[PDB]
Amino acid sequence: TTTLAFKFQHGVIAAVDSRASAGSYISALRVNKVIEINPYLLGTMSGCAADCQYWERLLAKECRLYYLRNGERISVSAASKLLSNMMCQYRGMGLSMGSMICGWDKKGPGLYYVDEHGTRLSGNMFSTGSGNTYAYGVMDSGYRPNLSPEEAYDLGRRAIAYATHRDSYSGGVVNMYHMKEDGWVKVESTDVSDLLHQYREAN
Amino acid sequence: TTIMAVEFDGGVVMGSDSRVSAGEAVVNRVFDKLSPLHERIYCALSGSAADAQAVADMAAYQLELHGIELEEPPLVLAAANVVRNISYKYREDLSAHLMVAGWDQREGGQVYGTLGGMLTRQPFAIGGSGSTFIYGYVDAAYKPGMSPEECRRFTTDAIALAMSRDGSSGGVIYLVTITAAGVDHRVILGNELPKFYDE
Amino acid sequence: TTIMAVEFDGGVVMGSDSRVSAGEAVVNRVFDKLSPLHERIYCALSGSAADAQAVADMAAYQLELHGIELEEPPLVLAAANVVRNISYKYREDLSAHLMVAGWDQREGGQVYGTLGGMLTRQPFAIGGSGSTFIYGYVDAAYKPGMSPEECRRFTTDAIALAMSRDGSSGGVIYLVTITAAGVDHRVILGNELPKFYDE
Amino acid sequence: MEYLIGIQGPDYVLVASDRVAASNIVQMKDDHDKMFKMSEKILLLCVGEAGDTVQFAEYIQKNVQLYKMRNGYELSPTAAANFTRRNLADCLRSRTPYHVNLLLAGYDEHEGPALYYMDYLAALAKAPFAAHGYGAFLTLSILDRYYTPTISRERAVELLRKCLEELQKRFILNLPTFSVRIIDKNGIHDLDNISF
Amino acid sequence: MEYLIGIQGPDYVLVASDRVAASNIVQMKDDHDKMFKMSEKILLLCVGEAGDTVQFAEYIQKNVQLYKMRNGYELSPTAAANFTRRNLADCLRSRTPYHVNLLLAGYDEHEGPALYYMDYLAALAKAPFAAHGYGAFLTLSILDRYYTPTISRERAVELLRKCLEELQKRFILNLPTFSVRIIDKNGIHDLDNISFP
Amino acid sequence: TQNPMVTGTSVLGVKFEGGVVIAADMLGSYGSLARFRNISRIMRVNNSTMLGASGDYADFQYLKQVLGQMVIDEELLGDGHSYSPRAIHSWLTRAMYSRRSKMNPLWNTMVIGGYADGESFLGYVDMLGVAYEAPSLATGYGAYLAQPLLREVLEKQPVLSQTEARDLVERCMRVLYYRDARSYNRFQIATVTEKGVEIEGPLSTETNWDIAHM
Amino acid sequence: SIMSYNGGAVMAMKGKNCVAIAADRRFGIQAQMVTTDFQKIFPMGDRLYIGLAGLATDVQTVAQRLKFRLNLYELKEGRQIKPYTLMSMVANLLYEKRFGPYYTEPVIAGLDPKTFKPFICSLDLIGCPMVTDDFVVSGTCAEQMYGMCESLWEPNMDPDHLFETISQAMLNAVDRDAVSGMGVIVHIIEKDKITTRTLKARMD
Amino acid sequence: TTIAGLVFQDGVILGADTRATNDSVVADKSCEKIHFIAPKIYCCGAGVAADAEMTTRMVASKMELHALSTGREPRVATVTRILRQTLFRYQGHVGASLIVGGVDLTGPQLYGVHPHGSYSRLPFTALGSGQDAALAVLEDRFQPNMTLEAAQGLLVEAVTAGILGDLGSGGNVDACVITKTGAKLLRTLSSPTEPVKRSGRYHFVPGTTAVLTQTVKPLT
Amino acid sequence: RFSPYVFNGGTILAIAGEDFAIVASDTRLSEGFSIHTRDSPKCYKLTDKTVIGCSGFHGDCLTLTKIIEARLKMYKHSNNKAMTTGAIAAMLSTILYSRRFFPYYVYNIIGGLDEEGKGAVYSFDPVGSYQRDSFKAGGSASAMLQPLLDNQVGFKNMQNVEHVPLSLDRAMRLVKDVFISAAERDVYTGDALRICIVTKEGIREETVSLRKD
Ligand SMILES: *[B]([O])([O])[C]([C]C1=[C][C]=[C]C([C][C])=[C]1)[N]C(=O)[C]([C]C1=[C][C]=[C][C]=[C]1)[N]C(=O)C1=N[C]=[C]N=[C]1
Ligand SMILES: *[B]([O])([O])[C]([C]C1=[C][C]=[C]C([C][C])=[C]1)[N]C(=O)[C]([C]C1=[C][C]=[C][C]=[C]1)[N]C(=O)C1=N[C]=[C]N=[C]1
Ligand SMILES: *[B]([O])([O])[C]([C]C1=[C][C]=[C]C([C][C])=[C]1)[N]C(=O)[C]([C]C1=[C][C]=[C][C]=[C]1)[N]C(=O)C1=N[C]=[C]N=[C]1
Ligand SMILES: *[B]([O])([O])[C]([C]C1=[C][C]=[C]C([C][C])=[C]1)[N]C(=O)[C]([C]C1=[C][C]=[C][C]=[C]1)[N]C(=O)C1=N[C]=[C]N=[C]1
Ligand code: NA
Ligand code: NA
After folding, report:
1. Domains, chain H, with CATH or none
2. CB neighbours (10 Å) of residue G78?
3. Is the residue at F1 inside a domain?
4. Which residues have any ligand 4 atom within 6 Å of their CB?
């Protein structure tokens, strides 16, 4: 897997890989590694597939239940803190889940990295998965806080694209979202080899 | 240990050696392994000393209260089931084999096997580390219709034969004859044991 | 396997079952474990089939050249030492027991044990997995001064008694009578085996 | 792997901690704060295993805050250090032990400045200066050499810079920036971050 | 743990390596050179286990030098890479295997610039650019992104700078100085060390 | 039971026209030792079903106790309903799986034979809850020796008479006695037809050792 | 597994009077890709090729130790080696290391030098020869390759049909293997000519 | 593998299946498990295919040197001993399980040789993962001094029971009859599985595969 | 040490079409190198528009199957309606994850119709992660059949090819040809192919034969 997310002038970009593997076999060429919790709250997934699906669906259920109770949406800080507390209860159980809780609330854009250990970090740039190092390299090189929405879509597209090239546990398609003030918009679902071929053909 | 029980017309004969060991060390050289479970019901102990004594203590207790409730001496089948159930429920934690034999008004003299929680009636039966070396002997020497004296001689010979060959068996042979009349206790000393080829 | 040898006035009697197993699987049910080492010398094979056959092949070779150099049939003591030395030198890598028995002008009929490189002369001897269950039987049934026929019945009875009790022993019984006159080979079929208590 | 340092003066406690939130071979964050304000005059600096640290530090924080609300006054650095110890030591033989190594700095109106060292085993020691992590092997002797009990805050800040400069010269781990704070009679004061 | 990098241009090979000699948690040396000149136009950059590296690199060096003395001419980067490969692969199933990871850069008058990658197992690969160590996980994608085969040496140094800057931002190891050298038609040229102060 | 003590070897089974026949030797082995050469390993469950068991004897006896009581329990009601062979097989699958899931298995592999409403039943259940129905079954080492002979005959003639099925089972027991080093020449043949369950024993197959003279 | 440390796949297929051999081009250590142009098929004659999957160091070593013996053989014999004889040379070369083997599973594809009748085979890591009249596979995606080959292979395929079949069987197999890919190369061996093609394959 | 032997009135019959398996995947649907040793001595191999192949090749080559020197037909006892002493030396690490059958001046003989170097002279035998299915058929229906076709039939049935019952066995039944006058190698004597048919429509129109590079080397 | 699992093999495969869904399986059940039975189809009818394919440890297959059967009845009683294909898939994920620490060693592939009457396939891993698919293979020969499904049913690696959607006739022919290839190379696949076809009209079953060895 290769997931990435970065804050910038126009919001938060969140891009994911789509490969699921069992040993060296590719179990799924395309898998959705982004849970759309609500119009303003997403979650990226990496690690154990069952842990990712069940645990993030449990955060979504608790987020939905919060809205019914208070009549307000949950904040990015409460949703990320909620997930890390669930992970904390199952410490030493062998869960594997790397996620980034991305959204927009009363305090602007929000991006948190949550781990199966109960790690909870707020930051403006993260990357998770077996190919995170490759994604960090490309992302760091071209990142400036004043990037255009289209310039940021290229940075997020290329960062995942180059990580699928070197990481055998990453491939398939890039699913990219742009988190704006009035909710997210799913930017694209683009084949990574078609992108890599486009960059090769440009040499 | 070498334990043995034999059925006859009016009851049973049970025998055992007398050795209690702890590794290559003889801890007790004169132990009586024939423990009474009721008046006319006995068991022969083998395996872990602590486990065998615990099961016997519990079986005698359960059978004492059982007998007083039925206003009758417990059946040897009931005593065999009592031991068997304990040995079966705790088979992962127990390492003892308690052979159960005795007498009844109903089925007379009966011999039972309790190995690892199982239950089996036998015309004669053997147990303990020493039994391994006398299987061929008891298979050749056993004949049906043996008198109580012939049963005591079969039991004494088989146990002495095993005692010689088995390091964990030795000492004295304790004999017990359960019949309608009551129980007889014999002891064959290490000096008086039957003699066979021992070279 | 159950192997056995018995000394008598004019020589020896050697017997063996016929089972060859590989785990709980019978690989060959009628194998003759009495292998000749010389005209009037034989060995009974037990343990690893590959190891027992290898030692026998080498011992027969060494004894053939030894016999031709002395211009005489090898002594049974020489054949026993030949087998013993191989079993001793390679005791960490071999897992076979080759009992050695036969006849000589000098010492006549002799029975030898070679277990793990040791050497012992025995009036009678037993080996293999099956021997464990007939120690008490052979200790009770052996009497000195047995005729060759009495040796053959004793060997037949003890091996059948072990065959019944031992899963690694079974099949037919192969008997061999080594005397000054020569060697006699008998086969007691699984249908003709002596019968004893088998329940 | 992480770095904590404390230097106690006659009337203050100076503390510093690395700012790296790392996972595997990557430096995920350069601006990570490892100090947790327990009271107006108490800081709990906490280092250790991935989840254990925030989980343990925040439980202690919330309970020290519950004491303030319940009684109208705050715990003393001594009572807050011993309360931290009671909980850590009680989890030691439990199914869920915490792998946290911490430092508690604080200022008491009656007892003055106090700096405490706590093992992950929950041994509590009061020290004039302390350090946690592999970095402590390279800096405890610098502190042994130059520390004096009358050390002014301006001088302790200089002594702290020498310890942090030593980690740049010899420590194999990349610890670029550090949080710096002083606790005194007027509370917790944030100082400029020591950066390289 | 250590870092090696190579970028091959149309007529040159640019290489860089960290300068840290470290034992346990201490940085014992800040000025440690990891490149070994084999010939006038060949450099062997070598990282790996504690003793294995200097021992292996110097054995190959002296044998490449013995070839020069014996025959009057030097080995080509290809023959020198395959000779390095034969020795490393021959020790693999022996009592004493070498845990060394290396890059061989060189310039041939007939075949041009060549950069080779070799892991401790002795697999030999010719690559336009390569990197060894944990740092390679953070920089291979930067090289994938910006490397072009017509890259001028001045541009390749800005690319190498982008990779070394990435190790300062994200690598947990302190690798603040690096040796930089270019091999071309005129031999091995020492460039200024890329430092981070 | 994590470690079995006295174990039974193969249990055979084959359905014929009008019922099912099941066979098993009367041996309980303690490793290689033929310790009990006369114990029954077959049980009549009720009028339509019968069970044979391989593996641990103490665990088989326990199941024989639990099943035996269930039957008594049902019969007290007398409501015109009784456990079909298929229902006993379903219960026994749930029983084995349940013990397996608590990491405390009952160390058995059993064969259930039955005859209800003109239909023959033959079902296999092992210590893990693996269950299935088949025209013929063979547990343990019998799955390697006897199942090929049962399937060989059932390939030529899929419907067998009670006599053909019986002779096929006697041929299989003879092979098992020759080849399985944990078998004994003492066995039982149980048959379930319209009339009900009939257990026959002790039986023995005649042996030929002429190959010794080759 | 040792064989999965580098990954890769190799395949050979029979045709009418032609023969095909294909392999992926990835060279990687575990989950990290190093180069996208690794050579796994080596010419042994005009119409004879050998493909080696497995551990990259032993793929290179076996090919080089085999070329040494081959060159000496052709010099002493004064003839180009027959395809079956090359198989026996590899079997003997690999079996010499029976109790400490090379981690390579070769595949041989060639045309006979007089009949021009194709020959395909494969050897396990200890040199067990296996000639087939259809296809042979070796790699980390052998299960995928067998599925594609079993479904796609037909008996008397023309060179063009053989090309489409071996190309589609390699591409679709390797695309379900994480550690195989980075392009595919195919050689079509006919009496008249060799045609080498690199396919446009996925790069992830 | 299911390999089997039989001794009939005028010789020996050797049977074998044609499956080679590489960890639950069938690698070869038709391999040859019956190997030549001498004109009237054949051997079935089961186990590690390279070990069966090479130990059979080495003993056949040693028997050619034997026969050339002696000037006589080789004896089956010689092949048994050469094989055993070689396998014993390798302590079972050479994983070849063999069934040696043949005819020499002393008549027809059938032997079982195991990887550790043990052997037995048997009237019928079976080795391999499917040996028990074959050994059941042989025990069930073997009678001494059988006729050529009765033995051929029993052998086919014995190998067939293994082909159908053993997952590690399949393909066809190969057979070899050895008599005083020589050996008849009956390859694919029986095929228990009729030719598998599909409605294969897997044609790719030329050009479907995207080609990036194409170089053509003309030859002569 | 006792192991609560055993591998009994078998292959399952499903294809989602415009107005249909096929769920297919072999009938072989084995253990080690033995065949338990040759008539063990892995297809289970849940509703008139939902079928499931189950493969792996047979003990877990039988149990998860009875639990699914019981849960549908419970849902029908509680909601007075049959579970849709999507609700069965979402539920199975929770049942599988309820055994996250002692898994059901089962590969599940649900096949049926969605609320628009179109084909729906949901594929799962033993621990409960699932997704909707166009098609999918599971069980012992999963890796042999999946690349051919990707190619012939997904049109992958084919340029200049007309993307004609699969018809029931054409998909049935493909299922019959892939199981023939699976039975040739996978020792655990064989004896017969059981095919379940789900349409507006309900479920039909077809049984074609595969190799007996
Ligand atoms: B990724 O490689 O971390 C990926 C994450 C993933 C996969 C499927 C679905 C989701 C969200 C719905 C996320 N994980 C996998 O590929 C893992 C193996 C793995 C784990 C950690 C690092 C690298 C690879 N695969 C599975 O969990 C899995 N595979 C097959 C079937 N079920 C689960
Ligand atoms: B016998 O050898 O099995 C013997 C039988 C036995 C049973 C009940 C009570 C006693 C004496 C209190 C003895 N048991 C032993 O001798 C065992 C050792 C043993 C067990 C099995 C085979 C051989 C030897 N003795 C003990 O366990 C024991 N005794 C003394 C001190 N520690 C332990
Ligand atoms: B006996 O049970 O010990 C038996 C005696 C023996 C001696 C020489 C030659 C043979 C036949 C070729 C048999 N040995 C065996 O049965 C052993 C196994 C064994 C060993 C010890 C106790 C019980 C059984 N047979 C083998 O080792 C073996 N046989 C065939 C194939 N592989 C191994
Ligand atoms: B048989 O199925 O046991 C078989 C015997 C065999 C195979 C091919 C050719 C010959 C004649 C020389 C004999 N053994 C195998 O198929 C083995 C694996 C095996 C081993 C033990 C039990 C079952 C199976 N397979 C190979 O050695 C092999 N497979 C593929 C390619 N090369 C070798
Ligand atoms: Na990839
Ligand atoms: Na088969």
Report:
1. 3-190 (3.60.20.10)
2. 6
3. no
4. G 124, 128, 130; H 1, 19-22, 27, 31, 33, 45-49, 52-53, 128-129, 168
Please identify which residue in the block is written with the tokens 């591998």: I7
**Domains detected in chain I:** 11-210 (3.60.20.10)
Contact D26 A132 (CB under 8 A): yes
Nearest-angstrom CA–CA distance, F40 and F36: 10
Query: How many angstroms from the chain centroid is the CA of residue G90?
Result: 13
Backbone angles phi, psi at G69, to 5 degrees: -65, -40
**Entry resolution in angstroms?**
2.4
Do F and C touch, counting CB pairs below 8 Å (3 needed)?
Answer: yes
Q: Does residue B1 carry a catalytic annotation?
A: yes
The span from the first CA to the last CA of chain B, in angstroms, equals 22
Could you list the residue range(s) of the whole structural domain that residue A197 is in? 3-201
Q: What are phi and psi of E118, to 5 degrees?
A: -140, 125
Q: Which domain holds residue F15?
A: 6-213
Alpha carbon of D189 to those of D15, D37, D58, G22: distances in Å? Answer: 11, 11, 21, 70
Number of domains in chain C: 1
Mutate to test the interface with C, among B133, B154, B198 (most CBs of C within 10 A): B133
Task: Compute φ and ψ for F36, nearest 5 degrees.
Answer: -120, 105
Q: Do G200 and A197 touch (CB under 8 A)?
A: yes
> Cα(C98)–Cα(C35) distance, rounded to whole angstroms?
10
Residue to test with chain F: of C16, C30, C161, C192, most F Cβ within 10 A: C30
Contact residues for A74 (Cβ-Cβ < 8 A; gap 6+): A41, A62, A63, A66, A67, A82
DSSP string, I13-59: EEEE-SS-EEEEEE--EEETTEEEES----EEEEETTEEEEEEE-HH
A193/G204 touch (CB, cutoff 8 Å), yes or no: yes
Parent domain of C177: 1-199
Query: Token pair for residue D91?
Result: 């989890």
d(CA D102, CA D84): 10
Do residues C12 and C4 touch, judged by C-beta distance below 8 A? Answer: no
Q: What is the dihedral angle through the alpha carbons of C161, C166, C172, C178, rounded to the nearest 10 degrees?
A: -70
Q: How many residues does chain D have?
A: 196
Closest-CA distance of chain F to residue I2, Å:
6
A137–chain E Cβ distance below 8 A for any pair: yes
* First-to-last C-alpha distance (Å) of chain G: 22
Q: Which two tokens stand for residue H156?
A: 């086919």
As for how many domains chain F has, the answer is: 1
F116 found inside a domain = yes
Q: Which residue has the tokens 């103490």?
A: F58
Residue H121 in contact with residue H110, Cβ under 8 Å? yes
Give the distance (Å) from ligand 5 centre to CA of residue A171. Answer: 5
Any chain C CB within 8 A of the CB of H122? yes
Specify whether the CB–CB gap between D39 and D61 falls below 8 A.
no
Among I148, I153, I140, CA closest to I210: I140
Alpha carbon of C45 to ligand 3 centroid (Å): 9
Choosing from H1, H174, H187 the residue with most ligand 4 atoms within 8 A of its CB, the one to mutate for a pocket test is H1
Q: Among C74, C128, C64, which residue's Cα sits nearest to residue C102?
A: C74
Q: Token digits for C176?
A: 């061999």
